Design a protein around this ligand. Structure first.
Ligand SMILES: Nc1ncnc2c1ncn2[C@@H]1O[C@H](COP(=O)(O)OP(=O)(O)O)[C@@H](O)[C@H]1O
Lengths: 447, 48
């Protein structure tokens, strides 16, 4: 009769690009007027439909596209649209142009770390494991005393079996404090041992106890399973740089040291390339190269604008997306040479420039309405028009910013929607980047 | 039809129900409870 429901988990927060859901193109390759949260920029959204096909062709390697335009014109919005269109499986690497300055590794090497992180890989691995409750454990002895064999009895639901294992497995078992009656899970690819606690049968033995009890495992004592794994080249490279696998003492104690980055040499990269090629030839490894997104590219030091010449002419380097919003500026680290967008001409010749233009007042209202319905606020027509004129006066970012506090004041006094009075009062409370400049230049002598 | 069927089945059948025989039996309370599907459930429902 009485219907009751429960819902206590909170929703996700709203970012600055939470409404962009795709490029919103058509099958013919043209650009709509308003689709998937994007309006306008037809000449730029159409040019981004070529790029997604270029990514999905898995053919080229070492192509760069540079999005250029005034601030607030939707560069990174287009980049996130491309990333959303390409799907989750394709690896996407966000990056800021100011991250190449590090105190541990050189500027040049971070670019490689990001390139190798951009390229993905899919592996179909097979792991054979022995699981179950230990019923008997015995270390064998031989001539020096040393240990040569380990005898382990594992009892699953199906039954029990006895196994002879390498002394390294015995060392790992003694390391984890494994006795009889404790459920264990050993994998034979790496020799790792995991203890889950005593069996559920030994529950009433002790009135007071601290160990957790797991039920008896079901299935066979020894079994192999297939695991599908998504990895990148940079994961293999970093794992082989400072290894942590294995049950020895060198890697165990390397697991505890401070994780400092290191400069990977060309030899390890080449050997990893050979190994992954061998994996591909076996019909298991599938390559899925992705996209690296470099934002604010205009502030890479000249030592990074020039290594990219050799870094992009490679046959492995993925597709790189640049983004800049600067005019004829001086190149950082040069103090004498000026160039468009800060990027030098020599590197600029290797990129395809996607021009971006400023927005018209008509699209401003549509963008504001889309953002308002994304946040979850209701705005009247006159208030939306007033926000439109405000945006035409200063910028659309300011209009988007004003949407939330206006709703706050609207819901303070019982109103359910934003009115013109709320927008005007908010515009009075907060200042623009240009009005504040005026009131600052008026009193410049006294600051 | 229904009246004819009731007349036909009236002689060689009985019935009591709960009011005739329950002299002290609290009326059971029936409660519905909607439950929302989780993330994984939704990924699978989408696949389906
Ligand atoms: N075509 C568009 N459709 C929807 N929103 C847009 C569009 N272009 C820009 N925006 C919005 O404008 C805001 C600022 O633009 P942004 O993407 O940061 O450009 P830039 O990187 O050049 O400053 C973003 O939050 C974005 O949501």
């Amino acid at each position: 009769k009485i219907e009751e429901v429960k819902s206590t988990t909170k929703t996700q927060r709203i970012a600055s690009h939470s409404h962009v859901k795709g490029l919103g193109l058509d099958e013919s390759g043209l650009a709509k007027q308003a689709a998937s949260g994007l309006v306008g920029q037809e000449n730029a959204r159409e040019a981004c439909g070529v790029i997604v096909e270029l990514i999905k062709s898995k053919k080229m390697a070492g192509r760069a596209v540079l999005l250029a335009g005034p601030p607030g014109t939707g560069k990174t919005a287009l980049a996130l649209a491309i990333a959303q269109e390409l799907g989750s499986k394709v690896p996407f690497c966000p990056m800021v142009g100011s991250e190449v300055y590090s105190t541990e590794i050189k500027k040049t090497e971070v670019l490689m770390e990001n390139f190798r992180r951009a390229i993905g890989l899919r592996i179909k691995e097979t792991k054979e494991v022995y699981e179950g409750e230990v019923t008997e454990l015995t270390p064998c002895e031989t001539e020096n005393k040393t240990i040569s064999h380990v005898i382990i009895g594992l009892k699953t639901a199906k039954g029990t079996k006895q196994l002879k294992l390498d002394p390294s497995i015995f060392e790992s078992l003694q390391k984890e404090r494994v006795e009889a009656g404790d459920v264990i899970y050993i994998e034979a690819n790496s020799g790792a041992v995991k203890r889950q606690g005593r069996c559920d049968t030994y529950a009433t033995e002790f009135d007071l106890e601290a160990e957790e009890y797991v039920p008896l495992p079901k299935g066979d004592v020894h079994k192999k399973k297939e695991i599908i794994q998504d990895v990148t080249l940079h994961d293999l490279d970093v794992a082989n740089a400072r290894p942590q696998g294995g049950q020895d003492i060198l890697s165990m104690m390397g697991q505890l040291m401070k994780p400092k980055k290191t400069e990977i040499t060309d030899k390890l990269r080449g050997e990893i390339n050979k190994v992954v090629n061998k994996y591909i030839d076996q019909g298991i490894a599938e390559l899925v190269p992705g996209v690296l997104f470099v934002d604010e590219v205009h502030m890479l030091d000249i030592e990074c604008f020039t290594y990219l010449h050799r870094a992009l002419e490679s046959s492995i380097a993925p597709i790189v997306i640049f983004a800049s919003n600067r005019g004829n500026c001086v190149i950082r680290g040069t103090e004498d040479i000026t160039s468009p967008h800060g990027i030098p001409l020599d590197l600029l010749d290797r990129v395809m420039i996607i021009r971006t233009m400023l927005y018209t007042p008509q699209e401003m209202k549509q963008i504001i309405k889309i953002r308002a319905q994304t946040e979850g606020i209701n705005i009247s027509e006159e208030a939306l028009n007033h926000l439109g004129e405000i945006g035409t006066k200063t910028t659309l970012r300011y209009s988007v910013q004003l949407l939330t506090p206006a709703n706050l004041l609207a819901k303070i006094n019982g109103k359910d929607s934003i009115e013109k009075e709320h927008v005007e009062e908010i515009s009075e409370l907060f200042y623009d980047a240009k009005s504040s400049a005026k009131i600052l230049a008026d009193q410049q002598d006294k600051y | 039809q229904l009246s004819r069927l009731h007349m036909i089945l009236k002689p060689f059948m009985l019935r009591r129900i709960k009011k005739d025989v329950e002299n002290e039996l609290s009326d059971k309370i029936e409660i519905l409870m909607y439950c929302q599907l989780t993330s994984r459930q939704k990924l699978l429902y989408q696949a389906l």
